[PDB]
Amino acid sequence: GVTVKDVNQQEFVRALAAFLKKSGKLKVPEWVDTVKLAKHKELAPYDENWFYTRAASTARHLYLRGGAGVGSMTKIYGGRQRNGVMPSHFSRGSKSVARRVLQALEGLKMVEKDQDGGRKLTPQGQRDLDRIAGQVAAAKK
Amino acid sequence: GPLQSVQVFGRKKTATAVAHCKRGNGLIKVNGRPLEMIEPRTLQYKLLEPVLLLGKERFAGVDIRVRVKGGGHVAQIYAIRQSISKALVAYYQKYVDEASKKEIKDILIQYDRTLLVADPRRCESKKFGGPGARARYQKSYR
Amino acid sequence: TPDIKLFGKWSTDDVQINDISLQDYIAVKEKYAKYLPHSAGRYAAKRFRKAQCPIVERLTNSMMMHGRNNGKKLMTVRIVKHAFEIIHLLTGENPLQVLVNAIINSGPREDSTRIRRQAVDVSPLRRVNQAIWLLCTGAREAAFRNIKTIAECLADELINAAKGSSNSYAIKKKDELERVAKSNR
Amino acid sequence: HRIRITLTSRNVKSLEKVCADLIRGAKEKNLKVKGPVRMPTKTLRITTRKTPCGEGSKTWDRFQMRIHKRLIDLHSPSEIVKQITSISIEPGVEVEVTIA
Amino acid sequence: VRHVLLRQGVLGIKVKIMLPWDPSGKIGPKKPLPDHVSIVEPKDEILPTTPISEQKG
Amino acid sequence: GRVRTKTVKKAARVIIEKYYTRLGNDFHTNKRVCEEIAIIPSKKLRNKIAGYVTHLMKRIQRGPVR
Amino acid sequence: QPIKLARVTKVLGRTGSQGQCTQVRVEFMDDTSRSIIRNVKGPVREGDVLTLLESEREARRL
RNA sequence: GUUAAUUCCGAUAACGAACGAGACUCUGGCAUGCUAACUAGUUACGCGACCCCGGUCGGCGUAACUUCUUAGAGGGACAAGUGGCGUUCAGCCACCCGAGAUUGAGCAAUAACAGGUCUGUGAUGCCCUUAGAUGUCCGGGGCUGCACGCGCGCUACACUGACUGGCUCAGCGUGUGCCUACCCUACGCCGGCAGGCGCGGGUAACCCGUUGAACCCCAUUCGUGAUGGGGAUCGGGGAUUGCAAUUAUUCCCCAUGAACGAGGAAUUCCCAGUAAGUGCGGGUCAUAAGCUUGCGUUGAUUAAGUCCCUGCCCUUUGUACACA
Ligand SMILES: [Mg+2]
Ligand SMILES: [Mg+2]
Ligand SMILES: [Mg+2]
Ligand SMILES: [Mg+2]
Ligand SMILES: [Mg+2]
Ligand SMILES: [Mg+2]
Ligand SMILES: [Mg+2]
Ligand SMILES: [Mg+2]
């Protein structure tokens, strides 16, 4: 068939977010609705289900490369730290939000903790990712 | 039977892209994904340029796999742009006749020198007493 | 399409350059038109290698100005592409032909200089460069502090320069420089 | 059996002469030898002011120290390695002999 | 560059000595000067106008 | 300014004066010939001397040299 | 005062105060026998056409 | 006459010379060729995972090799070939072949300033002090004080922009110390964050690290309103460093929401991977980048000229100047 690399990723993360909407058992934390996702961000996100979209993005990043822990997730979710009157720099994201994403993906079997540190992606998660890759391929065809 | 493996590098300012041609079907992919999804998408026809110039008949028998490291976005795009064309020219030089290789080389040269010859321009070193290479800080009289 | 080149969805051919003075210095026909106005570089090496640069690439390069926009060439490629779309959806002609006519109309045939100022007729390459600078300056002045986007402003400036209805800032500055040169000669 | 010689030096042609001499010694004493593996060199960079005091034009020195490190893997016992490395060493090259 | 402490003040001495070139390298440096192009003299040869042979062995 | 210096020109005149029979018109031949006969420390100076040797040999083939 | 085209046949030299005007010999492509000398701003190579608004003027040769 | 050059050709009461420039060293390219490699890999296989024979894997192991990795010897470019200009000499322009047909820095002559440095030195003359010390040690304050002006820089004045998500690429580098008490940090839990708690790796192509940096790309929210631009000022709280933060050391959260609508006279820097936008390393560092020094990404406008201004270098001319 196809893989996720033949699939356009921008609608693919939304499709896996819709898949998590269909599943609905990720056991979201209580402080999801009110928290700001980073020290360098300013506002809360405009979308009400940013947790599912970021878990979709976490799933496809762990599919592309495994063994990515909390520091690597803050590295991929870092950005500009607008210091106001001072020049901007790079700032990593929040640790606990990606920690809860990995706890949800360890709760329902999409990732697994690997030796020598980090999270790898399980063959069940690879199965679901290639199924939704075929879904987005059949949608765009 | 015999492996027609051709490994050809292509260089921008810092980005290096090594294309790999074999005997196979007409598929071209870079870092495990084809040319249709390489962001930014404004340089999609720039990636399609050797296919549009040479037709699908030349690329039908050649499969190209490219490993890329270094540079930026436009640097990697122009690196794979140069590398797949140089890899096809080296493949058609080694395994088929030199006349079609010379014709394809003429077609590439009459379009752009960047498709074959790499640009030797690299970043000039910053000097002391300036924010950049040639520019100096603002001299203050009085 | 291996033989004829298609600028996106636009044809290289059917582009009539009216002014024979601007025939060589407008590099748009049969050799210099490509798929995108983006390129590698090297055009600023020799003196008249700038004439061999295509005019859509020259507009793409001259659009990025004023600090915050320097070095966004993919972004101004997007601007020029949507501007060509708006030019087609308003006029109903070739956007390349509209831009060539805009260069021919907006390019000032004479200027005045210090040899008290005396008027002299300018070089055609300098005239092309002056037209590209003036229409870009008019488009940026129309887009600054305005609801109307940069693509719509650049399309309106090129269409007004191709029409010559004295509503464009480039046409106005061209007529002003031509009137000053007619006065001090 | 696998003994690793690490050759660190500041000068270039002297280090090349030392590693070539070790290659010729291994070839004369008939043992399996790997090629001289180059490491990426290190450029110790110091940027100070030329003026001892603070009053002058803004000039800056660039003190560079280039260091180089090659390595040679030998398939030989320890006495052969000691006998080879005891002979013909020059002060520019520091030798680190790892038994394992 | 050296110092000397006299009674009235302190004097500095700068001695710069250019070493001559040698093939051995004991009295000076081994590398010759970048401007000195050492051109050797050609040997005196006599061109033979008569073809002869030197057959031996 | 690609102007040859006196250390190039006088040494080239000495080479052509002593070894006129060996030198020729081809640059890549008489460059190696000048490398063999003369002790030249650097490749750039060797190329300058070889180029001025080729130019003086062109002057000799055209006419008499002062 | 009609508009006349003129092809550059020879550039003479740099003129102007700051050195910004090329002294240019132009042959008219309408009347091929008549030719004049004018100062021209901008980069000028041999063999291109200027669109002169009047042909009656002439620059002073220095 | 020519050159970036007192660089050469040629004349010649000059000849023979010397420093400088040039030459040289490093850096950047080009070598499908040589040497190399379990502290870089490549492509083939053997498996493993997933999708409908084929595709992906920085998931694992090994089979030749070095194209990508690194660093050594070499080579390559010289106005050499062509067409013109030129005393047909010195040299100049364009073109073919070609990775280059001016890449950048270091070094840098004679003579001087009464240029800066005694607050770099246990480099130092002379003068002052030397026990109620200008020596040395400790506590606190100051070097931050604010009617004012100047300078180097940062933030911006937005719609070519801001916010919120998703995609996605770097290279210079640095890292556990003689005294020295102070390293880079992976990963798992706690917390929204600043951070804290435990096992590990690394004296370095081994680990941080495939350094998942930003600009940019894609998709919503905004609608020309001092607005979701801009974040100055100020209140409340929570963490780290240190013996000690008050005159808030820094960082994080909420809130307060000023001028500024592209800037007068005047002035700075620059022409190719250059300016500019943009972020990342080193120094200062216990805590620490609005500076500086390097590096990387995106990447142009215009120019192949001139003495108009500012100045410099030769020749002639005049001088009542020679601290000129
Ligand atoms: Mg980011
Ligand atoms: Mg607008
Ligand atoms: Mg003094
Ligand atoms: Mg003084
Ligand atoms: Mg005290
Ligand atoms: Mg102070
Ligand atoms: Mg507001
Ligand atoms: Mg804001």
Ligand SMILES: [Mg+2]
């Ligand atoms: Mg400072």
Ligand SMILES: [Mg+2]
């Ligand atoms: Mg008088």
